[PDB]
Design an enzyme around this catalytic site. Sequence first.
Site, PDB file in Angstrom:
ATOM      1  N   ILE A 193      -4.553  -8.289 -10.711  1.00 42.88           N
ATOM      2  CA  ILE A 193      -5.372  -9.159  -9.869  1.00 42.88           C
ATOM      3  C   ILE A 193      -6.407  -8.301  -9.143  1.00 42.88           C
ATOM      4  CG2 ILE A 193      -5.393 -10.758  -7.920  1.00 42.88           C
ATOM      5  CD1 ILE A 193      -2.372 -11.168  -8.580  1.00 42.88           C
ATOM      6  N   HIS A 201       5.395  -6.552  10.053  1.00 45.33           N
ATOM      7  CA  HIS A 201       4.274  -6.502   9.110  1.00 45.33           C
ATOM      8  C   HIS A 201       3.433  -7.771   9.124  1.00 45.33           C
ATOM      9  CE1 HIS A 201       7.172  -3.554   7.366  1.00 45.33           C
ATOM     10  NE2 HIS A 201       6.073  -2.873   7.092  1.00 45.33           N
ATOM     11  N   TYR A 210      11.148  -0.208  16.170  1.00 44.36           N
ATOM     12  CA  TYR A 210      10.668  -0.910  14.969  1.00 44.36           C
ATOM     13  C   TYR A 210      11.183  -2.351  14.900  1.00 44.36           C
ATOM     14  CZ  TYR A 210       8.531  -0.928  10.298  1.00 44.36           C
ATOM     15  OH  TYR A 210       7.761  -1.164   9.174  1.00 44.36           O
ATOM     16  N   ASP A 236      11.866  -9.589   8.633  1.00 44.54           N
ATOM     17  CA  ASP A 236      10.934  -8.466   8.710  1.00 44.54           C
ATOM     18  C   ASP A 236      10.996  -7.788  10.086  1.00 44.54           C
ATOM     19  OD1 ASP A 236       8.794  -6.642   7.968  1.00 44.54           O
ATOM     20  OD2 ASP A 236       7.315  -8.108   8.699  1.00 44.54           O
ATOM     21  N   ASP A 256       6.248  23.051 -11.991  1.00 44.52           N
ATOM     22  CA  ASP A 256       5.424  22.865 -13.174  1.00 44.52           C
ATOM     23  C   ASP A 256       5.139  24.222 -13.814  1.00 44.52           C
ATOM     24  OD1 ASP A 256       3.386  20.741 -14.492  1.00 44.52           O
ATOM     25  OD2 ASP A 256       2.415  22.698 -14.359  1.00 44.52           O
ATOM     26  N   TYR A 262      -2.073  -2.150  -5.301  1.00 43.19           N
ATOM     27  CA  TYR A 262      -1.464  -3.471  -5.258  1.00 43.19           C
ATOM     28  C   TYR A 262      -1.945  -4.300  -6.439  1.00 43.19           C
ATOM     29  CZ  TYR A 262       0.058  -7.846  -2.939  1.00 43.19           C
ATOM     30  OH  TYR A 262       0.666  -9.039  -2.600  1.00 43.19           O
ATOM     31  N   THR A 263      -1.008  -5.010  -7.069  1.00 47.08           N
ATOM     32  CA  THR A 263      -1.279  -6.009  -8.115  1.00 47.08           C
ATOM     33  C   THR A 263      -2.347  -5.565  -9.111  1.00 47.08           C
ATOM     34  OG1 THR A 263      -2.802  -7.249  -6.678  1.00 47.08           O
ATOM     35  CG2 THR A 263      -0.457  -7.927  -6.734  1.00 47.08           C
ATOM     36  N   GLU A 302      -8.750   6.620   5.271  1.00 49.28           N
ATOM     37  CA  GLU A 302      -9.491   6.168   4.097  1.00 49.28           C
ATOM     38  C   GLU A 302     -10.995   6.313   4.311  1.00 49.28           C
ATOM     39  OE1 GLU A 302      -7.988   2.733   1.936  1.00 49.28           O
ATOM     40  OE2 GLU A 302     -10.030   1.938   1.811  1.00 49.28           O
ATOM     41  N   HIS A 341       3.531   6.862  10.631  1.00 46.15           N
ATOM     42  CA  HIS A 341       4.831   6.515  11.210  1.00 46.15           C
ATOM     43  C   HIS A 341       5.505   7.732  11.836  1.00 46.15           C
ATOM     44  CE1 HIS A 341       5.290   2.291  10.391  1.00 46.15           C
ATOM     45  NE2 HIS A 341       5.104   2.422   9.090  1.00 46.15           N
ATOM     46  N   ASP A 383      -7.789  -8.220  -4.279  1.00 46.42           N
ATOM     47  CA  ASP A 383      -6.773  -8.558  -3.298  1.00 46.42           C
ATOM     48  C   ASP A 383      -6.205  -7.283  -2.678  1.00 46.42           C
ATOM     49  OD1 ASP A 383      -5.300  -7.642  -5.444  1.00 46.42           O
ATOM     50  OD2 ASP A 383      -3.769  -9.208  -5.283  1.00 46.42           O
ATOM     51  N   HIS A 429      -0.767   5.727   6.163  1.00 43.91           N
ATOM     52  CA  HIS A 429       0.122   4.795   6.853  1.00 43.91           C
ATOM     53  C   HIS A 429       1.508   5.419   7.045  1.00 43.91           C
ATOM     54  CE1 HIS A 429       1.683   0.515   7.557  1.00 43.91           C
ATOM     55  NE2 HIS A 429       2.788   1.183   7.283  1.00 43.91           N
ATOM     56  N   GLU A 430       2.068   6.006   5.980  1.00 48.14           N
ATOM     57  CA  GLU A 430       3.416   6.581   6.066  1.00 48.14           C
ATOM     58  C   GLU A 430       3.458   7.783   7.001  1.00 48.14           C
ATOM     59  OE1 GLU A 430       5.375   4.513   5.003  1.00 48.14           O
ATOM     60  OE2 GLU A 430       3.982   3.425   3.679  1.00 48.14           O
ATOM     61  N   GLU A 475       3.429  -0.834  13.357  1.00 47.31           N
ATOM     62  CA  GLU A 475       2.800  -1.145  12.074  1.00 47.31           C
ATOM     63  C   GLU A 475       1.276  -1.095  12.149  1.00 47.31           C
ATOM     64  OE1 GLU A 475       3.307  -1.761   8.821  1.00 47.31           O
ATOM     65  OE2 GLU A 475       5.065  -0.588   9.407  1.00 47.31           O
TER      66      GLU A 475
HETATM   67 CA    CA Z   1      -4.762  -6.030  -7.077  1.00 51.52          CA
HETATM   68 CA    CA Z   2      -7.847   0.280   2.168  1.00 47.80          CA
HETATM   69 CA    CA Z   3       1.865  21.136 -16.308  1.00 49.82          CA
HETATM   70 CA    CA Z   4     -10.446   1.232  -0.466  1.00 49.74          CA
HETATM   71 ZN    ZN Z   5       4.653   0.756   7.991  1.00 48.13          ZN
END
Ligand code: CA
Ligand code: CA
Ligand code: CA
Ligand code: CA
Ligand code: ZN
EC number: 3.4.24.27
Length: 316
Positions: A197, A231, A157, A226, A57, A193-194, A177, A146, A200, A142-143, A166
């Site tokens: 909505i 999961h 896995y 899966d 940058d 997510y979503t 978090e 792993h 959720d 989470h990632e 998982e």
């Molecule tokens: Ca959502």
């Molecule tokens: Ca959370």
């Molecule tokens: Ca910049």
């Molecule tokens: Ca949260």
């Molecule tokens: Zn995972």
Amino acid sequence: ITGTSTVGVGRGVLGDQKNINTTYSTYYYLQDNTRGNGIFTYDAKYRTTLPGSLWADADNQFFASYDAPAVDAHYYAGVTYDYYKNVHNRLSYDGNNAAIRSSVHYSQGYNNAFWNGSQMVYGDGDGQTFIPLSGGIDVVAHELTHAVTDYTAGLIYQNESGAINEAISDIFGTLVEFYANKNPDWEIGEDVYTPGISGDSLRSMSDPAKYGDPDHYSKRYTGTQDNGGVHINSGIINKAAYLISQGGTHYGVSVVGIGRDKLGKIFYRALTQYLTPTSNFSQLRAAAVQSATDLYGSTSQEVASVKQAFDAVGVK
Ligand SMILES: [Ca+2]
Ligand SMILES: [Ca+2]
Ligand SMILES: [Ca+2]
Ligand SMILES: [Ca+2]
Ligand SMILES: [Zn+2]
């Protein structure tokens, strides 16, 4: 790259401003030298060739829409590093301050994130199922978890070992978090997510069944989708972890909660001292019992609550 450590400012996926550790050498790069052997964030430029180019940058200000997923991948990797170091005395994912690398803008419309064996990778989502997935601190943690799992217990896995793998990522994603303490909950991925909505999430640890995931071993998935339900069956372990921390009565079995910090200590010790690549759910119970015994004593409430929680989800 060789250069001098600098502090940029930018906006993340959800529109929030944050400072980011950068490195100056002609350009300002998303390279944080303040943590271990560095945190490095790359632009995959909507392609699938990894890692892509180290994020450059011109002015150390990261307020463009295209910048937002990079800001958050970089910043939340730092928070996750801090959690492991400050809470568990672990230096990066390998315990030896390995450089942490992430790529953003992976592919087009990509509704996932992953650890590829060597680095973290984040899609932008399609705008319907997900927005850019690095906007979720639980997702980032989470990632990275792993990678921790792969360097420690090495859980394969698939099937039960994969569902443990998982759940470990969901558990520590959630504990990170809470560590950052911005809108913390026991849900997974709610911030990305979503977007259309409200209320959720991708998974729930407090009530896995809300999203069709089992909350008792008798409801486990035994098919081949899966990777054998990694999961899906994670819900059984996530529920046990939630009960250990928060308590509750589940299928008539009462669990006395012991809190998040002790949950994290027990599961971190289980992961790093007792689990193996092929551990199943029963072996996880034994590992958690032994870990709590080491930390708190055989007659402790903590041991008793671990047993209660696994009983509540039908794991002996
Ligand atoms: Ca959502
Ligand atoms: Ca959370
Ligand atoms: Ca910049
Ligand atoms: Ca949260
Ligand atoms: Zn995972």
